[PDB]
Write an enzyme that holds these catalytic residues in place. Structure first.
Site, PDB file in Angstrom:
ATOM      1  N   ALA A   1     -77.319 -10.895 -25.220  1.00  0.00           N
ATOM      2  CA  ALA A   1     -76.448 -10.145 -24.325  1.00  0.00           C
ATOM      3  C   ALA A   1     -76.711 -10.494 -22.865  1.00  0.00           C
ATOM      4  CB  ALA A   1     -76.578  -8.637 -24.546  1.00  0.00           C
TER       5      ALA A   1
ATOM      6  N   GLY B   1     -77.045  -8.965 -29.681  1.00  0.00           N
ATOM      7  CA  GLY B   1     -76.869  -9.365 -31.066  1.00  0.00           C
ATOM      8  C   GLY B   1     -78.150  -9.816 -31.737  1.00  0.00           C
TER       9      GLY B   1
ATOM     10  N   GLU C   1     -79.911  -6.987 -33.869  1.00  0.00           N
ATOM     11  CA  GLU C   1     -79.355  -6.693 -35.186  1.00  0.00           C
ATOM     12  C   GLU C   1     -79.843  -7.682 -36.235  1.00  0.00           C
ATOM     13  OE1 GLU C   1     -75.916  -7.285 -33.270  1.00  0.00           O
ATOM     14  OE2 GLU C   1     -76.195  -5.451 -32.095  1.00  0.00           O
TER      15      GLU C   1
ATOM     16  N   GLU D   1     -74.899  -3.309 -24.870  1.00  0.00           N
ATOM     17  CA  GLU D   1     -73.504  -3.671 -25.077  1.00  0.00           C
ATOM     18  C   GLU D   1     -72.573  -2.527 -24.715  1.00  0.00           C
ATOM     19  OE1 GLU D   1     -72.401  -6.560 -25.623  1.00  0.00           O
ATOM     20  OE2 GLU D   1     -73.533  -7.693 -27.121  1.00  0.00           O
TER      21      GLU D   1
END
Lengths: 246, 243, 243
Positions: free
Chosen positions: B65, B110, B113, B133
């Site tokens: 990010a 991301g 995750e 995010e």
């Protein structure tokens, strides 16, 4: 093999200590059978409010992992141990009388899955905890996989199952498994602090509540309230609801 | 655009690294498919018994990010960046072999995750996690919210979902975001200390619990006793029980 | 009966305060309804981004277990008494924006059932939680047996419900009942700080994430995963994504 005394304020605390020191409280069929009879003959007993689950002597709570090993059979008979194992693991967690796993000493193997069957997993600081079921190549079968992960979580549940190493009681306090870490022979006296503080409360507002928490984890939030309001309504029809409003 | 090394006692443990160093091992369209192809589409071989994962370089694990801004497309073109990552986060955690997350510095956006798509997260004292995010107008990546609340809980997930807070890696262990904390220099060898222990015990003793564990996390408890009994019975049909 | 203020950057934070300090701000059947219209029945206006709730007095948040209780007859109305809390807890749990609980002092019984319904809990150093509702005779009213099984855990939640007692903030900090614990002199100011980080964030990202998470806790991971993706592309047509 089991033992029992019944004495407290107004006569009775159900001290249950599995007494078979030779094999170190190894969980066989008989030590799984008499538990049902001593906990189902205790089902309809109105003279016992609180139950403490401890081990005999000063050696261990249960060490059936690396001590009791006779399972050289076909896989068909393994289910009979799985069915019998699930007959004992959950019948302690479904007794309305609040049961506490007053763990002292070693509590691995069957005791690793038996300790998690109570309400508060208060244990001796001498307790070396672990699940050495995997080291012989078989994951726990009595409910050590789908009941542990809902207690400490899933991040830490992998560590003590995938690895197969013994951890201390103090280390277990950082994962939420043991709800209180306190000494062992004090755990005899210190449990009575929590074994009659529970008894000092009502007689239906504890076990009827036990019917809501033990079944609300298997349903969503909205259905969870669906069982709790009737329980709030059911305990509302007791002489204890208005006696203590003073 | 990657690499993988497999070796252990009896050659059982693997090591995969996101070897895209220039933009700090970010997550994009071209790399996500690589991670799903590298793990071989929901299954792996028998020779490999564990897959260790980290980021090559000793720097950040994934700055997902910070420099990755390929998100100017039509609303009908976002499924391929949302479903694929779910597929990316579907079989990393669900592969039929344990995976250890050697967390390595940053995991923004991301990348986190993917880390939450692992079993065990051996952390280090230099990481700076977070899901900022929501600060841009979009939830976290490819299943951050549902997975995070299942690991940490319902209380400490909103504090990271809503804020996109920075937080350190020492207080990450305070919330159960990771499992073990060891110095970064010794992290590579410390991750091996667990993998060889997960390699020297047994194969069926874990894969028949990995399947059992990764199915009962959603349904009720009696259903949770359903797969285990068949899995427990299935694990007595192998000579490893007698070994 | 109530008093609320709203003043911060971005003009989106709300300080909802219970204004019955003489009677220790204990909940009843007439103040719960006063909190229903305050949050405007499952929705609110377009002038808000964050919500802060804390009883007035700086002595006890909502202590209402052993200070106010009248029901000693007509057991059928218990559902009528239990339904009001459910309507007052479902409204706050669903509400468009997160609710910040800056509890400072006692919070037990029905008041204990209020902070746990909030998204994030921050408590003063002298916090006295725990439901003594069992000492009265009946289990908790509008949850307790339910809302505490997804925050702290399944084991460390039995202790409060069964025994019935009062603990401190640091223990609640340790068990995770309240996320962050701060001194009483730096809590009301700090509640206005955590929200302001949210207040400068995306308007549509915070609301969607609350909807995505609060309805994903009730299903399977695979089948609650749809909640995120559906709300994922719901924010791909608003300027928050691009501007």
């Amino acid at each position: 093999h089991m033992s029992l005394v019944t004495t407290s304020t107004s006569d009775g605390i159900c001290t249950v200590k599995i007494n078979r020191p030779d094999k170190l409280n190894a969980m066989n069929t008989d030590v799984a059978k008499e538990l049902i009879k001593t906990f189902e003959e205790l089902n309809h007993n109105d003279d016992v409010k609180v139950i403490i689950l401890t081990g005999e002597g000063e050696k261990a709570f249960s060490a059936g992992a690396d001590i009791e090993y006779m399972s050289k059979i076909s896989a068909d008979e393994s289910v009979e141990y799985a069915k019998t194992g699930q007959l004992v693991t959950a019948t302690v967690e479904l007794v309305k009388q609040p049961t506490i796993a007053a763990v002292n000493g070693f509590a691995l193997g069957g005791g690793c899955e038996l300790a998690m069957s109570c309400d508060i997993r208060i244990a001796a600081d001498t307790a070396k905890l672990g699940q050495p079921e995997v080291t012989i190549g078989v994951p726990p079968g009595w409910g050590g996989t789908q009941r542990l992960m809902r207690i400490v979580g899933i991040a830490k549940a992998k560590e003590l199952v995938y690895t197969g190493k013994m951890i201390k009681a103090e280390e277990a306090k950082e994962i939420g498994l043991v709800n209180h870490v306190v000494p062992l022979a004090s755990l005899q006296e210190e449990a009575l602090k929590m074994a009659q503080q529970i008894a000092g409360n009502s007689t239906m507002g504890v076990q009827m509540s036990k019917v809501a928490i033990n079944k609300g984890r298997n349903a969503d939030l909205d259905t969870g309230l669906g069982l709790e309001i009737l329980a709030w309504r059911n305990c509302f029809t007791h002489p204890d609801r208005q006696e203590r409003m003073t």
